[PDB]
Design an enzyme around this catalytic site. Structure first.
Site, PDB file in Angstrom:
ATOM      1  N   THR A  60      53.250  49.020  14.332  1.00  0.00           N
ATOM      2  CA  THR A  60      51.948  49.498  13.871  1.00  0.00           C
ATOM      3  C   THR A  60      51.937  49.640  12.358  1.00  0.00           C
ATOM      4  OG1 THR A  60      51.548  50.631  15.975  1.00  0.00           O
ATOM      5  CG2 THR A  60      50.274  51.374  14.082  1.00  0.00           C
ATOM      6  N   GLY A  61      52.950  50.319  11.810  1.00  0.00           N
ATOM      7  CA  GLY A  61      53.041  50.469  10.361  1.00  0.00           C
ATOM      8  C   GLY A  61      53.044  49.141   9.633  1.00  0.00           C
ATOM      9  N   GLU A  97      43.801  53.461 -13.105  1.00  0.00           N
ATOM     10  CA  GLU A  97      44.778  53.677 -14.170  1.00  0.00           C
ATOM     11  C   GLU A  97      46.209  53.495 -13.673  1.00  0.00           C
ATOM     12  OE1 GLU A  97      44.233  57.315 -16.490  1.00  0.00           O
ATOM     13  OE2 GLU A  97      46.194  56.959 -17.422  1.00  0.00           O
ATOM     14  N   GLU A 140      63.359  45.456  12.318  1.00  0.00           N
ATOM     15  CA  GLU A 140      62.623  45.940  11.151  1.00  0.00           C
ATOM     16  C   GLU A 140      62.612  44.969   9.978  1.00  0.00           C
ATOM     17  OE1 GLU A 140      62.514  50.421  10.531  1.00  0.00           O
ATOM     18  OE2 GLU A 140      64.612  50.038  11.057  1.00  0.00           O
ATOM     19  N   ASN A 150      60.652  64.016   5.491  1.00  0.00           N
ATOM     20  CA  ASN A 150      59.225  63.972   5.199  1.00  0.00           C
ATOM     21  C   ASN A 150      58.811  65.055   4.213  1.00  0.00           C
ATOM     22  OD1 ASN A 150      59.001  61.799   6.862  1.00  0.00           O
ATOM     23  ND2 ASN A 150      58.110  62.926   8.596  1.00  0.00           N
ATOM     24  N   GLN A 158      53.275  61.121  10.295  1.00  0.00           N
ATOM     25  CA  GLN A 158      54.105  62.302  10.076  1.00  0.00           C
ATOM     26  C   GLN A 158      54.246  62.616   8.591  1.00  0.00           C
ATOM     27  OE1 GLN A 158      56.660  62.607  14.126  1.00  0.00           O
ATOM     28  NE2 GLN A 158      57.718  61.513  12.471  1.00  0.00           N
TER      29      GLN A 158
HETATM   30  N1  LIG Z   1      60.767  58.916   6.386  1.00  0.00           N
HETATM   31  C1  LIG Z   1      60.257  58.786   7.719  1.00  0.00           C
HETATM   32  N2  LIG Z   1      60.546  57.544   8.364  1.00  0.00           N
HETATM   33  C2  LIG Z   1      60.036  57.378   9.713  1.00  0.00           C
HETATM   34  C3  LIG Z   1      59.329  58.291  10.418  1.00  0.00           C
HETATM   35  N3  LIG Z   1      59.098  57.710  11.615  1.00  0.00           N
HETATM   36  C4  LIG Z   1      59.658  56.465  11.589  1.00  0.00           C
HETATM   37  N4  LIG Z   1      60.259  56.310  10.390  1.00  0.00           N
HETATM   38  C5  LIG Z   1      60.876  55.010  10.320  1.00  0.00           C
HETATM   39  O1  LIG Z   1      59.773  53.856  10.469  1.00  0.00           O
HETATM   40  C6  LIG Z   1      60.402  52.869  11.109  1.00  0.00           C
HETATM   41  C7  LIG Z   1      59.904  52.815  12.579  1.00  0.00           C
HETATM   42  O2  LIG Z   1      58.512  52.628  12.514  1.00  0.00           O
HETATM   43  P1  LIG Z   1      57.455  53.718  13.116  1.00  0.00           P
HETATM   44  O3  LIG Z   1      56.577  54.255  12.002  1.00  0.00           O
HETATM   45  O4  LIG Z   1      58.118  54.799  13.952  1.00  0.00           O
HETATM   46  O5  LIG Z   1      56.598  52.736  14.074  1.00  0.00           O
HETATM   47  P2  LIG Z   1      55.005  52.698  14.293  1.00  0.00           P
HETATM   48  O6  LIG Z   1      54.297  52.457  12.984  1.00  0.00           O
HETATM   49  O7  LIG Z   1      54.572  53.909  15.055  1.00  0.00           O
HETATM   50  O8  LIG Z   1      54.813  51.311  15.162  1.00  0.00           O
HETATM   51  P3  LIG Z   1      55.174  51.069  16.757  1.00  0.00           P
HETATM   52  O9  LIG Z   1      55.734  52.358  17.279  1.00  0.00           O
HETATM   53  O10 LIG Z   1      56.170  49.955  16.785  1.00  0.00           O
HETATM   54  O11 LIG Z   1      53.828  50.766  17.337  1.00  0.00           O
HETATM   55  C8  LIG Z   1      61.907  53.201  11.030  1.00  0.00           C
HETATM   56  O12 LIG Z   1      62.374  52.681   9.851  1.00  0.00           O
HETATM   57  C9  LIG Z   1      61.867  54.733  11.131  1.00  0.00           C
HETATM   58  O13 LIG Z   1      63.137  55.205  10.527  1.00  0.00           O
HETATM   59  C10 LIG Z   1      59.025  59.630   9.721  1.00  0.00           C
HETATM   60  O14 LIG Z   1      58.412  60.508  10.228  1.00  0.00           O
HETATM   61  N5  LIG Z   1      59.502  59.817   8.385  1.00  0.00           N
END
Ligand SMILES: Nc1nc2c(ncn2[C@@H]2O[C@H](COP(=O)(O)OP(=O)(O)OP(=O)(O)O)[C@@H](O)[C@H]2O)c(=O)[nH]1
Ligand SMILES: Nc1nc2c(ncn2[C@@H]2O[C@H](COP(=O)(O)OP(=O)(O)O)[C@@H](O)[C@H]2O)c(=O)[nH]1
Ligand SMILES: CC(C)(C)c1[nH]cnc1/C=c1\[nH]c(=O)/c(=C/c2ccccc2)[nH]c1=O
Ligand SMILES: [Mg+2]
Lengths: 437, 425, 155
Positions: free
Chosen positions: A145-146, A254, A183, A228, A15
């Site tokens: 995932t992240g 750099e 988290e 975002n 996103q």
């Molecule tokens: N700034 C921002 N934070 C996000 C967004 N989506 C999730 N977050 C945050 O990221 C964390 C949750 O992880 P996600 O990115 O939704 O999870 P994912 O990477 O899809 O991994 P899984 O769903 O567990 O497979 C939390 O801290 C959310 O507040 C977004 O679009 N923008």
């Protein structure tokens, strides 16, 4: 011209990526279908924007971007959004079953099912490059995932692209806008396994962005959309030097030279000003001195911490807009006298300066007013270790009771990885303490 | 993942299961013929979670109906939505279980289980990405309890990577046919401890007390009790049927609700409690945390919350919800364990349930649930010490040590709750 | 030995069979291996007419098995109200204590037999009687949150 590939992992990374590339298109004059009337070399070129966009014979400018997620919900929105024709369709890659907020699923059990496809598709983009310089990787700390898939991908990229730089934009968790109790675990696990593989990482504290939306943009309950677009504004201010002519941070190497004195302390603090509500369209324009002073106010930081109780190792100012160099120099001179900004004794104390004279861009659906001049300050301060301390403390509270650990051990992770990661974080906090002196 | 496979076993299981399908069918605009005559596009966005789409825009519940008693399958079929279920998904015997866990688990139930699993396999094979299973049943009878837990074990073996959640009705002398119910429930709880990911403890003791003392129903019926159950099950599944903006399957929710694998027995709650004006957000929050609104007969102030989820439904101030949820944790911080930071999470669904503009569903993982298990254990022990009616179970092959084992597992679970109730950071 | 047959007939509710065995000299106070008598078994399984017959022909209303259980303990545990009444009418010890320290009041309270609790109280059940863990029936009702029972136990 040396190419950069942006990789977006998980919901947050995807996103935020969508918002970044929307803004990039606006800054470069690219339409949602990829056409760029101002680019008079049709089907090719070596202009600065080609670091981030390739060109087709039909004049289509295509982001050098990959989006990866373990379930399809979020990437399906990209496939059908305003910019559904912008990206390589094969660079939007999804599994069916996500990591369930479990690092171990993202890194071991579920992530392993798609990692080879992701690498083969990245290789296709890399093969398009005449001189690939590296990767910009966008992801949350808190998602399964992240956190877990990003770590796996970074490990694999280090093997397959040994000489390429890898930079991160990492979303640091805030409970105000999260529903993931685990988290802190995911955050420490991914930081431990990614530290060796990342050359420079810009953490974005969701609580900081939340605060700015509430306080500067008068948004009572910020949505991810609100967060975002602000984050994208800041990311753009950081990556502009790679996409435009300029004199500071002109390639990924750099960034490390200017911001990372040695490899583990590679987490610069970003501070951005001014952030003004779009409702205030007739705000009086701020001076170079005013926006520069604002860079040393905690309210404008991307990560909540107190640089006044840390030491600086690096400080770069990236200006955009109607900014006269002599006025920057005088503002910097004033900053040093008025404020107590302490550097370590082994680094040059000068502030590096870049100026992009094009007025900053805002997205019409955005919450930000247009401004005549803006600045992003990137500093490497030991104060950012306070962000690690807060995460490590929450980790410790839960891990003392082994709360939730069984979920990770059941998904391909040894329990010892928890303490191994936590010891690495303890060493990292000690690294900052020793540099602070 | 998307699809859920629903199983309902025994008389109670089929009764509350049928009410569940009536309620969520109405919420999704599905009439008793499976035809969609809804009014909002949001009614169909996640319809595949619980319904298979057939020809002619016809939606069929992904539901399997099981009973050793034939009569119960007849009563479901004659119900309002009886004709909506897949006829081949009715799996029933002819003998019944006689309120005997042993018959459901080892005798008549064992002879029928493979037929049920064949239907389960058929439903699972046609899922794009199966999330897992939900089972409705009572623990106090023979079929839902004994055959239900046999089914759970068999499903756990065949689908080890899928979530298994139960809505499990706990027996009470206030709503009781026989004194063997503590036997049947105690034998079942050990099965649930090992083989389910989440169990919603629907306590007939609490349901009766709500109807009698709060709703002023002098003679509560099963229909009165089940009115509370269906409201709760609708609320607990709202996040999967009207996901709005949350991106969470069954596993992600279980990860964030269950810090210890055996301690997965939840106290459900619902506000407002009603019998067959709109509340404010403060009233919703207050009533949700009130012991009198709990669907398990346990006092939350006698334990500590490990985790809490709350689902608000209706048009309301998201900020006000945040303020009220904050206020509860602040005034009563001692009742939320400090070693799970940020352990209370909430979601808001714009679409309210039937007949209410404002509602809230509470899902508590509280150490106070040990009170429910101690209540059943005390009755189990009173009976077992006198060896009353044991030959009904030993006659089906069971060993007296199996009763001893079940007693020990029950009290081990209680001890585990107490351990985390007294822990400190 | 008609003792074992009478024990089984009493347990199974075989009214006509109980009458025949007694008519042929069967021991009305026979015991099984654990000390249960025909009256214990009839009281446990709810056979009211058999309980009456045995009491009319020499059964010991207060016999104890090896664990100290009387017929009244078992009727109060299982919840047979009419049998509780009959046993009390024939002199059952309302406050008999078994090897766990339980009285009939404890067992009726644990199992939620509220009508039987009231009858026992009316016949002098000891509200102060403690089981081996120190609990009275009232303690059990407060510990398990049974407000209906706690209200009854206060008179
Ligand atoms: N700034 C921002 N934070 C996000 C967004 N989506 C999730 N977050 C945050 O990221 C964390 C949750 O992880 P996600 O990115 O939704 O999870 P994912 O990477 O899809 O991994 P899984 O769903 O567990 O497979 C939390 O801290 C959310 O507040 C977004 O679009 N923008
Ligand atoms: N809340 C509720 N409890 C029920 C219902 N039907 C039976 N029970 C309860 O379930 C238990 C009896 O189990 P039952 O389902 O009838 O036996 P089975 O057919 O062998 O599974 C008792 O605790 C009953 O109070 C019902 O419709 N609603
Ligand atoms: C953020 C929020 C409130 C959505 C949440 N966070 C953790 N848990 C939940 C809710 C649930 N958690 C669950 O585990 C849940 C289980 C379920 C759902 C459908 C059918 C059966 C069980 N249903 C829920 O609504
Ligand atoms: Mg995700």
């Amino acid at each position: 011209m040396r190419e950069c590939i942006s990789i977006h992992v998980g919901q947050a990374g995807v996103q935020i990526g969508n918002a970044c590339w929307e803004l990039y298109c606006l800054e470069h004059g690219i339409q949602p279908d990829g056409q760029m009337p101002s680019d008079k070399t049709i089907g090719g070129g070596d202009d600065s924007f080609n670091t981030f966009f390739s060109e087709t014979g039909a004049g289509k400018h295509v982001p050098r971007a990959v989006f990866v997620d373990l379930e399809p919900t979020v990437i399906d929105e990209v496939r059908t959004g305003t910019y559904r024709q912008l990206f390589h369709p094969e660079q939007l890659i999804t599994g069916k079953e996500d990591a369930a907020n479990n690092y171990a699923r993202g890194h071991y059990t579920i992530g392993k099912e798609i990692i080879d496809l992701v690498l083969d598709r990245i290789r296709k983009l890399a093969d398009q490059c005449t001189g690939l310089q590296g990767f910009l990787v966008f992801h949350s700390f808190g998602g399964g995932t992240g956190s877990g898939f990003t770590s796996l991908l970074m490990e694999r990229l280090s093997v397959d692209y040994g000489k390429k730089s890898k930079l991160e934009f990492s979303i640091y968790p805030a409970p105000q806008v999260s529903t993931a109790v685990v988290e802190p675990y995911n955050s420490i696990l991914t930081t431990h396994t990614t530290l060796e593989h990342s050359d420079c990482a810009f953490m974005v504290d969701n609580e900081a962005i939340y605060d700015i939306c509430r306080r500067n943009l008068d948004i009572e309950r910020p949505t991810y959309t609100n967060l975002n677009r602000l984050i994208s504004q800041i990311v753009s201010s950081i990556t502009a030097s790679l996409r435009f002519d300029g004199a500071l941070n002109v390639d990924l190497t750099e960034f490390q030279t200017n911001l990372v004195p040695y490899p583990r302390i590679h987490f610069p603090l970003a501070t951005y000003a001014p952030v003004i509500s779009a409702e205030k369209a007739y705000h009086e324009q701020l001076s170079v001195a005013e926006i520069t002073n604002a860079c040393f106010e905690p309210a404008n930081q991307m990560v909540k911490c107190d640089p006044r109780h840390g030491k600086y190792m690096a400080c770069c100012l990236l200006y955009r807009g109607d900014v006269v160099p002599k006025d920057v120099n005088a503002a910097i001179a004033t900053i040093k006298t008025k404020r107590s900004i302490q550097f370590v004794d082994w680094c040059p104390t000068g502030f590096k300066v870049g100026i992009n004279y094009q007025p900053p861009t805002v997205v019409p659906g955005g919450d930000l007013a247009k401004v005549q001049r803006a600045v992003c300050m990137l500093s490497n301060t030991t104060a950012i270790a306070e962000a690690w301390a807060r995460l490590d403390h929450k980790f410790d509270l839960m891990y003392a009771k082994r709360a939730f650990v069984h979920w990770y051990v059941g998904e391909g992770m040894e329990e010892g990885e928890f303490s191994e990661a936590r010891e690495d974080m303890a060493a990292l906090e000690k690294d900052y303490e020793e540099v602070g002196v | 993942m998307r699809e859920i496979v629903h199983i309902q076993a025994g008389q109670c299981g089929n009764q509350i299961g049928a009410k569940f399908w009536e309620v969520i069918s109405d919420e999704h605009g599905i009439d008793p013929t499976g035809s969609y005559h809804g009014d909002s596009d949001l009614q169909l966005e996640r319809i595949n979670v619980y319904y298979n789409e057939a020809t002619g825009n016809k939606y069929v519940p992904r539901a399997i109906l099981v009973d050793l008693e034939p009569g119960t399958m007849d009563s479901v079929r004659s119900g309002p939505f009886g004709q909506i279920f897949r006829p081949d998904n009715f799996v029933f015997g002819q003998s019944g279980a006689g309120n005997n866990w042993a018959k459901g688990h080892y005798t008549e139930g064992a002879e029928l289980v493979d037929s049920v699993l064949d239907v389960v396999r058929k439903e699972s094979e046609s899922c794009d990405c199966l999330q897992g299973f939900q089972l409705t049943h009572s623990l106090g009878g023979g079929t839902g309890s004994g055959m239900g837990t046999l089914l759970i074990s068999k499903i756990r073996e065949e689908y080890p990577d899928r979530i298994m959640n139960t809505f499990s009705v706990m027996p009470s002398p206030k709503v009781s046919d026989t004194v063997v119910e503590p036997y049947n429930a105690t034998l079942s709880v050990h099965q649930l401890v090992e083989n389910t990911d989440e169990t919603y403890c629907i306590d007939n003791e609490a349901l009766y007390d709500i109807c009698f003392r709060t709703l002023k129903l002098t003679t509560p019926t099963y229909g009165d009790l089940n009115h509370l159950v269906s409201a709760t099950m609708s609320g607990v599944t709202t996040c999967l049927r009207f996901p709005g903006q949350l991106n969470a399957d069954l596993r992600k929710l279980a990860v964030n609700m269950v810090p210890f694998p055996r301690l997965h027995f939840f106290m459900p709650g619902f506000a407002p409690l009603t019998s067959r004006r709109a509340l404010t957000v403060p009233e919703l929050t207050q009533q949700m945390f009130d012991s009198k609104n709990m669907m398990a007969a346990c006092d939350p102030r006698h334990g500590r919350y490990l985790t809490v989820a709350a689902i608000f439904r209706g048009r309301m101030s998201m900020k006000e919800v945040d303020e009220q949820m904050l206020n509860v944790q602040n005034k009563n911080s001692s009742y939320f364990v400090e070693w799970i930071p940020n352990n209370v999470k909430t979601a808001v669904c714009d679409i309210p349930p039937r007949g209410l503009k404002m509602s809230a569903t509470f899902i508590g993982n509280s150490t106070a649930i040990q009170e429910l298990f101690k209540r059943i254990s005390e009755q189990f022990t009173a009976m077992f010490r006198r060896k009353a009616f044991l030959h009904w179970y030993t006659g089906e092959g069971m060993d007296e040590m199996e009763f001893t084992e079940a007693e020990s597992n029950m009290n081990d679970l209680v001890s585990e709750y107490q351990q985390y109730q007294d822990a400190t950071a | 030995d008609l003792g074992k047959k009478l024990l089984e007939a009493a347990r199974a509710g075989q009214d006509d069979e109980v009458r025949i065995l007694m008519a042929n000299g069967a021991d009305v106070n026979a015991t099984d291996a654990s000390g249960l008598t025909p009256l214990h078994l009839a009281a446990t399984y709810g056979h009211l007419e058999i309980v009456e017959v045995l009491l009319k022909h020499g059964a010991d209303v207060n016999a104890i098995d090896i664990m100290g259980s009387t017929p009244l303990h078992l009727a109060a545990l299982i919840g047979h109200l009419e049998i509780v009444e009959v046993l009390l009418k024939h002199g059952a010890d309302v406050n008999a204590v078994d090897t766990w320290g339980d009285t009939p009041l404890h067992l009726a309270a644990i199992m939620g037999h509220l009508e039987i609790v009231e009858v026992l109280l009316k016949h002098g059940a000891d509200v102060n009687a403690q089981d081996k863990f120190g609990k009275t029936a009232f303690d059990i009702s407060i510990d398990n949150g049974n407000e209906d029972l706690a209200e009854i136990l206060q008179k």
